[PDB]
């Protein structure tokens, strides 16, 4: 859609892979502020707002805290304490058409600065002078929407760029979107460090003759000590024994 009508998507309760996006190197700009770019794969977020739109090249730098400009002030306002990431990639070879691509429009002027994450449903004509336009143009009356001259022969600074802003919001609600988890081949009959579903420890894993219920994950004996756990990806119930130790 248009940049002033940026497409907003709500994302929750899924695994979000950012390693492929980071290592693709097909995005001109990949800037994450308020979070550690390496730690998105290792952190979970309550909700994700994906704001997708298309702008020109020189306006990419305006998508940052403390920036001033047409897009930041009148189209899409980001807070100074914004917590999220911006991914911008050139689409010249995909958005090039004979005669230019003028489908996308951007808001040029507004009565006041937009509030953060504010969607505009009113298209009031900008009032430059003392006589209100009231939907009638003329002197001191300029339309707030302006086209993009996405000519194939134009410079890179004016070339179209597709920009997706992923805003990670956390509230008094459980985290839903989570990063990818790395699974490593298990080893048996060895005093090894284990990490099952965030439960960490050390021990020796062996086959178990016990019978879990279909929904049960791990079992603990008396004194609140985990003695069995079901390895996923095989659903194998395994007994666990503390590493052999003693006095000398």
């Amino acid at each position: 859609a248009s940049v002033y009508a940026w497409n907003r998507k709500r994302i929750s309760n899924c695994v979000a892979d950012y390693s492929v996006l980071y290592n693709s190197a097909s995005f001109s700009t990949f800037k994450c502020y308020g979070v550690s770019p390496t730690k998105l794969n290792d952190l979970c977020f309550t909700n994700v707002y994906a704001d997708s739109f298309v702008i020109r090249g020189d306006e990419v730098r305006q998508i940052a805290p403390g920036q001033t400009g047409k897009i930041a002030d009148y189209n899409y306002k980001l807070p100074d304490d914004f917590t999220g990431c911006v991914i911008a990639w050139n689409s010249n070879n995909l958005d090039s058409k004979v005669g230019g691509n003028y489908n996308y429009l951007y808001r040029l002027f507004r009565k006041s600065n937009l509030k953060p994450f504010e969607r505009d449903i009113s298209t009031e004509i900008y009032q430059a002078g003392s006589t209100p336009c009231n939907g009638v143009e003329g002197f001191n009356c300029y339309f707030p929407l302006q086209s993009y001259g996405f000519q194939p022969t134009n410079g890179v600074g004016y070339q179209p760029y597709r920009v997706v802003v992923l805003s990670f919001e956390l509230l008094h609600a459980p985290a839903t979107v989570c990063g990818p988890k790395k699974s490593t081949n298990l080893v048996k009959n060895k005093c090894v460090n284990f990490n099952f579903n965030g439960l960490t420890g050390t021990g020796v894993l062996t086959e178990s003759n016990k019978k879990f219920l279909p929904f049960q994950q791990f079992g603990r004996d008396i004194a609140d000590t985990t003695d069995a756990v079901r390895d996923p990806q095989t659903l194998e119930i395994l007994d666990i024994t503390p590493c052999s130790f003693g006095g000398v």
Epitope: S2, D58, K70, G99, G100, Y102, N103, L105, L108, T123, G135, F143, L145, Q146, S147, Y148, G149, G155, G157, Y158
Partner: nanobody, 121 residues
Framework: QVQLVESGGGLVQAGGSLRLSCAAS????????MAWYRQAPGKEREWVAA????????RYADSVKGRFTISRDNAKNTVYLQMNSLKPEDTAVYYC??????????????WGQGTQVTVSA
Amino acid sequence: QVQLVESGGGLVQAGGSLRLSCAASGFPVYRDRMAWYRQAPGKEREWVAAIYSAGQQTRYADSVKGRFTISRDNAKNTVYLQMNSLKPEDTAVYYCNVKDVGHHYEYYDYWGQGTQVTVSA
């Protein structure tokens, strides 16, 4: 390059019908704003008509509402301007206008040559 042409107009009797055609090549007419102005001899410039690709479909002057229509065709890339119930105030020069934005926040307006319309009572 980009060139625009206005066809139609001339000398016509009162009460007739007129159909102007604005044809622009080098850029599609489906854009932010397409403007049409009237200029009278010895009078100031004033906005008349506009068509937009978002929000309100069309905008007309307050003195021509109800008897004046405009449409566009992107396949053949031409804007038709149909008008009926001619009035003596319509004897003027019609201008077809576009606006564009530069790389350095500079706005350039491409103005049309326009066509003269004369109404005889």
